[PDB]
């Protein structure tokens, strides 16, 4: 839920 | 009046429930594929963090019309949904699902769960970019993905959302034409909004290999069958006009509409590919405009209906194309003493008409003349308005000339509360349905019509009629009531399977849906003798022309009402065109040109005329004084047509020249 | 309540 990328 | 014998027991063992436990959010349905069966369900929910409940995104997932689901919110790894973005279903039977996740913020870009299996398999994406628009598939190719970000890039997708490639920075508006060509609208400075009136009009055919201005001081564009339409600004003026192009943008045709100013618009409220509706919106807050219909350049049109109801800011319209008839549209229009009423045309909007009421009905309050009126219709307008209406009409293109609306009897558009009202004729004669507001449904291209009554209270009764809405059976589809929300059905209108959704009376409220299969109601398959022979149109029997619309007559193998039996699946309409020797009624006037029956030349060139015809390419100044209607394919008979013109020295001649 | 699934110029 609500994941981060970069 | 309801000859289907015990059919309790048909309907009984053919109901299906499914109760939705843990769901206590917004719902979306998507149906992925034709004769796939295959339904998704989305749901979104978002709770205060100060609240011990925690947040939902569920996801189900139907393989028989609605019949089970299965809960496979694992397939997405439990990621939430963004609501706005919903389900973006691929076109026709490719089974392409892409959902769009809500990713916390700070990312680099966002991310998708994209399925090439009617959502069997899902796979992640994270994207180069946070998408602001839904993803759109390219009707030619449906592995082809384009989407607007945050930033206003246009980014591309080759290979159904895997890899992303921006191919412009500045991008207002884009869609997907014909053959993979997309057209976008750019601004230069600031932002979309400052830029209004000063866009350019770009388009690809590679893909953002490439492009093309096809357009500057752009408003807005749009497409409608073969058309490109653009609206264009003045110099030195806030006003702007329709201009059409019918080669993707390579040639381009200002039209013969009026220009409009800043708080009006138009509307391209109906193209196929032969013409296309236009309204224009009228100068100043009256919330009504004028239709015209096009010639099949999208070029010359003629006014069609004067105050055409159409709400501020392009809002609510009642136009409906009656699509189980040809040539037939509905829509309302507003009185000089600000009724509504209801008009029908049966020819494409060549000539408008009352909608004649059912021989049994009296007449409102709202009619002056307590045993003549018409029958007028509830539409998307009448339920902005707060009327008690749950539907606007129905029709279906396998459903041949039925037609299901609710409305009121009388000179005007009634508040009561409506009954439903039925045509089996696309239009020309009605007959009340039901009494009182009810959801309605078409399965079986007519061969089953079913029916549930809108109430403040639960529910456990659906109705249905398998004789095209004269008789009717009712049948209770579950013990316990349930607050009805809606009707889900294959789209189509082919499917013997309809869904009840609605939820349980209450300690919190469940969803659930009842779907009913009808294989057993109609145990028996359609056959020759079924069938009758039935010409649409008909006005008067005994004339040589009856039927005659546009130039053609269509005769059709229609079900009897009284054959009780299932049209099937791979059901195909059949009708025979006999085609009408042209008369002048199937000629419409070229530019210059009108008629107090014969187009005969206009000595007064004023308005919008004087402006196509000082600023219109020759090509179009050059008229026969006659045109054929589009869609039009009357042979024989009259021929008025020629070359015998050129306008432009007619109006150039009362300006001195330099 | 629940979602089952003119150009403006
Ligand atoms: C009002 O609704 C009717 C019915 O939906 C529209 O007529 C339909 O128009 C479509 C598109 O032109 C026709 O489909 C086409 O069929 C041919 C095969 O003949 C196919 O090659 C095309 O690719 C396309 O799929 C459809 O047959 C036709 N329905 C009829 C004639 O009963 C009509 O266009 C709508 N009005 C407006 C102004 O759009
Ligand atoms: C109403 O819903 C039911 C599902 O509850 C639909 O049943 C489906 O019917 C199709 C058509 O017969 C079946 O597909 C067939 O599968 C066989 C393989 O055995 C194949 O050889 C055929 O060519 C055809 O593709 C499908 O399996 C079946 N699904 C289920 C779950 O039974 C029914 O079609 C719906 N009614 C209507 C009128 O659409
Ligand atoms: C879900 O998470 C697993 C493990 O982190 C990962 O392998 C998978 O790619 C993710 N997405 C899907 C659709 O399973």
């Known amino acids: 839920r609500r994941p981060y990328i970069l | ?658």
């Open chain 2, 1 to 658: 009046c309801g000859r289907v014998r015990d059919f309790v027991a048909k309907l009984a063992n053919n109901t299906h429930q499914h109760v939705f436990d843990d769901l206590r959010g917004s719902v979306s349905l998507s149906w992925v594929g034709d004769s796939t069966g295959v339904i998704l369900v989305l749901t979104t929910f978002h709770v205060p963090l100060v609240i011990m409940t925690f947040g939902q995104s569920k996801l189900y997932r139907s393989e028989d019309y609605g019949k089970n689901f299965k809960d496979i919110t694992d397939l997405i790894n439990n990621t939430f949904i963004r609501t706005e973005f919903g389900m973006a279903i691929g076109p026709e039977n490719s089974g392409k699902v892409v959902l769009t996740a809500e990713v916390s913020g700070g990312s680099r870009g966002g991310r998708i769960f994209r399925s090439s299996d009617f959502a069997k398999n899902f796979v992640q994406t994270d994207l180069p970019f946070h998408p602001l628009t839904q993803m759109m598939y390219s009707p030619q190719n449906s592995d082809y993905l384009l989407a607007l970000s945050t930033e206003n890039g246009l980014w591309v997708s080759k290979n159904f959302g895997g890899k992303w490639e921006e191919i412009h920075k500045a991008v207002c508006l884009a869609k997907w034409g014909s053959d993979n060509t997309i057209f976008f609208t750019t601004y230069a400075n600031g932002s979309c909004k400052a830029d209004l009136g000063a866009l350019e009009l770009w388009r690809t055919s590679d893909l953002g290999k490439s492009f093309k201005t096809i357009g500057v001081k752009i408003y807005s564009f749009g497409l409608g069958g073969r058309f490109l339409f653009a609206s264009v600004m003045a110099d030195k003026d806030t006003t702007r006009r329709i201009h059409v192009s019918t080669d993707q943008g390579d040639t381009w045709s200002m039209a013969q509409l009026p220009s409009v100013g800043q708080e009006q618009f138009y509307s391209i409220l109906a193209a196929n590919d032969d013409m296309v509706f236009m309204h224009v919106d009228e100068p100043g807050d009256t919330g009504f405009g004028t239709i015209f219909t096009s010639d099949d350049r999208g070029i010359v049109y003629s006014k069609s209906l004067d105050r055409h109801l159409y709400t501020t800011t392009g809002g609510e319209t009642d136009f409906t194309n009656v699509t189980s008839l040809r040539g037939v549209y509905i829509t309302s229009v507003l009185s000089e003493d600000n009724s509504i009423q209801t008009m029908i045309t049966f020819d494409q909007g060549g000539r408008w008409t009352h909608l004649r009421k059912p021989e049994n009905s009296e007449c409102d309050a709202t009619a002056k003349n307590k045993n003549e009126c018409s029958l007028h219709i509830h539409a998307s307008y009448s339920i902005s308005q707060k009327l008690n209406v749950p539907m606007a009409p129905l029709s279906e293109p396998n459903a041949v000339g039925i037609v299901i609306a609710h409305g009121s009897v009388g000179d005007a558009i009634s508040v009561m509360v409506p009954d439903v009202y039925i045509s089996d004729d696309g239009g020309y004669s009605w007959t009340k349905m039901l009494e009182g507001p009810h959801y309605y449904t078409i399965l079986d291209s007519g061969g089953i019509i079913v029916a549930i009554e809108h109430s403040s209270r639960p529910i456990n009764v659906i109705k249905f009629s398998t004789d095209e809405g004269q008789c009717w059976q009712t049948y209770t589809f579950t013990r316990d009531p349930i607050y009805f929300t809606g009707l889900a059905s294959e789209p189509g209108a082919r499917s013997m399977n309809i869904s009840i959704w609605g939820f349980t009376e209450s300690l919190t409220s469940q969803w659930v849906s009842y779907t009913i299969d009808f294989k057993d109601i109609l145990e028996r398959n359609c056959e020759e003798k079924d069938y009758t022979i039935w010409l649409a149109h008909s006005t008067d029997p005994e004339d040589y022309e009856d039927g005659c619309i546009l130039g053609y007559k269509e005769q059709f193998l229609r079900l009897r009402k009284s054959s009780m039996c299932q049209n099937g699946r791979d059901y195909v309409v059949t009708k025979q065109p006999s085609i009408c020797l042209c008369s002048l009624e199937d000629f419409l006037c070229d530019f210059g040109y009108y008629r107090p029956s014969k187009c005969v030349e206009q000595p007064e060139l004023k308005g919008h005329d004087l402006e196509f015809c000082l600023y219109g390419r020759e090509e179009h100044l050059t008229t026969n004084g006659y045109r054929k209607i589009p869609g039009d394919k009357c042979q024989g008979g009259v021929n008025p047509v020629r070359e015998v013109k050129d306008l432009k020295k007619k109006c150039t001649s009362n300006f001195l020249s330099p």
